[PDB]
């Protein structure tokens, strides 16, 4: 149980839900367990814009905050989606096959799976240098897998930040990189329907598309 209420760059912290669309778990710190819900995208059944949009240079690392620290086992993953030219980010929900993955977490494989996200209160998110400047949504998710051996038991903790990415390049992620939310995930996916406990897995297939790099 945690939210992802903040993102920041190089000018101190922001306020909760200042640059992050207020997630529907803002009171209970709970999860989405329905990969078919609109909430799987930005945790909003009713779209509501963030108060502001954060300017960040492509190729730099910003910070996505959690509250309180992440403590369920499983991966952090981050996706970007570029708002079309002529559309206002405040109004854009990010529907269709527009999301590309820029990070996913692999566990360390030992007697148990250990996750570097354990105990972390924030995460560095490296924005690709080569993507086109524009307005973007940055989707954060943590997937808690402690009881995920049953369908519908994986716990998704999600939010989305509004960014203005500057100083871009000209690389467009391929069609194979871009997915929709809902759409990208199925309840049967091997990194969602999974017993991480015993026997311990010796590999882990993150859900969603390949990580896009320049
Ligand atoms: Cu919890």
Author numbering: 1 to 214
Which lines from the publication concern this structure?
An oxidative system was recently discovered in which extracellular flavocytochromes, that is, cellobiose dehydrogenases (CDHs), cooperate with copper-dependent lytic polysaccharide monooxygenases (LPMOs)8910111213 to catalyse redox-mediated glycosidic bond cleavage in crystalline cellulose, hemicelluloses and starch. CDHs are large flavocytochromes containing a haem b-binding cytochrome domain (CYT) connected by a long, flexible linker to a flavin adenine dinucleotide (FAD)-binding dehydrogenase domain (DH). The DH domain oxidizes cellobiose at the C1 position to cellobiono-1,5-lactone with reduction of FAD. The ensuing step involves inter-domain electron transfer (IET) from the reduced FAD to CYT haem b, presumably by single electron-transfer (ET) events, followed by ET from CYT to external electron acceptors such as LPMOs.
NcLPMO9F primarily attacks crystalline cellulose and promotes, in combination with cellulases, faster and more complete surface degradation. The structure of NcLPMO9F demonstrates that this LPMO shares the essential features of fungal LPMOs, including a β-sandwich fold and a catalytic surface-exposed copper centre in which the copper is coordinated by the ligands His1, His72 and Tyr157. We determined that NcLPMO9F is expressed in Pichia pastoris as a 214-residue non-glycosylated protein. As observed for the fungal LPMO GH61D from Phanerochaete chrysosporium, the N-terminal histidine in NcLPMO9F is not methylated, in contrast to the methylation of other N. crassa LPMOs expressed using the natural fungal host1523. Both NCS molecules in the NcLPMO9F crystal have copper ligated by four protein atoms in tetrahedral coordination and exhibit distorted octahedral coordination of the copper with mer-[MA3B3] geometry together with external ligands. In molecule A, two water molecules, one axial and one equatorial, satisfy the octahedral sphere. In molecule B, both water molecules are replaced by the carboxylate oxygen atoms of Asp33 from molecule A, which is similar to the coordination sphere observed in Streptomyces coelicolor ScLPMO10B where two oxygen atoms in an acetate molecule occupy the fourth equatorial and axial position on the solvent-facing side of Cu(II)34. These observations emphasize the possibility of the 4-coordinate Cu(II) in NcLPMO9F to accept one axial, and possibly also a fourth equatorial ligand (water or other). We observed very rapid NcCYT-to-NcLPMO9F ET with a haem b-kobs value of 67.2±2.3 s–1. Our results demonstrate unequivocally that, in the N. crassa CDH IIA-LPMO9F pair, the reduced haem b alone acts as the reductant of the NcLPMO9F copper centre in vitro.
